Design a protein around this ligand. Structure first.
Ligand code: CA
Ligand code: CA
Ligand code: CA
Ligand code: CA
Ligand code: CA
Ligand code: CA
Ligand code: TB
Ligand code: TB
Lengths: 118, 126
């Protein structure tokens, strides 16, 4: 199946430098341990699968299995997922569609928010 | 890089796009003649819904990606990210420009040459 290896490797390195380089974020990352988040970017044919472990997040373009959480949005909603206080508004407006366990995306957005200085 | 210090998201996005474009377009010497058409060109990409631009600077051994450019761009493209999977060939490029899904300012030949390069990068199995 099309794994899109160059794009997924690039997204993986980006997410690992941003979220996993700092050991100060360890306890915030512990909330996502063993979780599988499926990201469907509207207009794109392939899904992105994020598998969280202690050392890093692995990204795949193809997954045989279930995701704990699935998020559907247009590309312009992705930069908005670095703010915990605006996730409820995005979900309410339908800009971000959530299937499965909403806690997985809430925990991810809380992590990304703590990863970056405003 | 090798450090514990928190670094901004924007330079990580441009570094990531740069790495991607160089592996995809610049690794294969078979694409040399297609790359020659973009030498010295500056392509500004404004992704609708995003606040910041992407600047692509084509040289012989690589394309550099920046988040800012005080100078002159040879071509400026404005589109939503969902048009990227739609610009496979030059036939589709004309339809996207005709429909206004892709807005072009400056030299249209730069984006035609870029799309023609990406299309040949897919044909070339390297
Ligand atoms: Ca923050
Ligand atoms: Ca560079
Ligand atoms: Ca000019
Ligand atoms: Ca120029
Ligand atoms: Ca193609
Ligand atoms: Ca190739
Ligand atoms: Tb599948
Ligand atoms: Tb602008």
């Amino acid at each position: 199946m099309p794994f899109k290896p160059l794009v997924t490797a690039g997204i993986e390195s980006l997410l690992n430098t941003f979220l996993y380089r700092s050991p100060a974020l360890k306890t915030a990352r512990s909330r996502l341990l063993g979780k599988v988040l499926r990201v469907e970017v509207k207009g794109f044919s392939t899904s992105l699968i994020l598998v969280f472990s202690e050392r890093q997040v692995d990204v795949l373009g193809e997954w045989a299995g279930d995701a704990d959480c699935t998020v559907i949005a247009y590309a312009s909603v992705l930069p908005k997922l670095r703010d915990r206080q605006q996730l409820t508004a995005l979900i309410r407006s339908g800009e971000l569609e959530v299937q499965g366990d909403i806690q997985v995306v809430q925990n991810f957005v809380a992590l990304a928010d703590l990863a970056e200085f405003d």
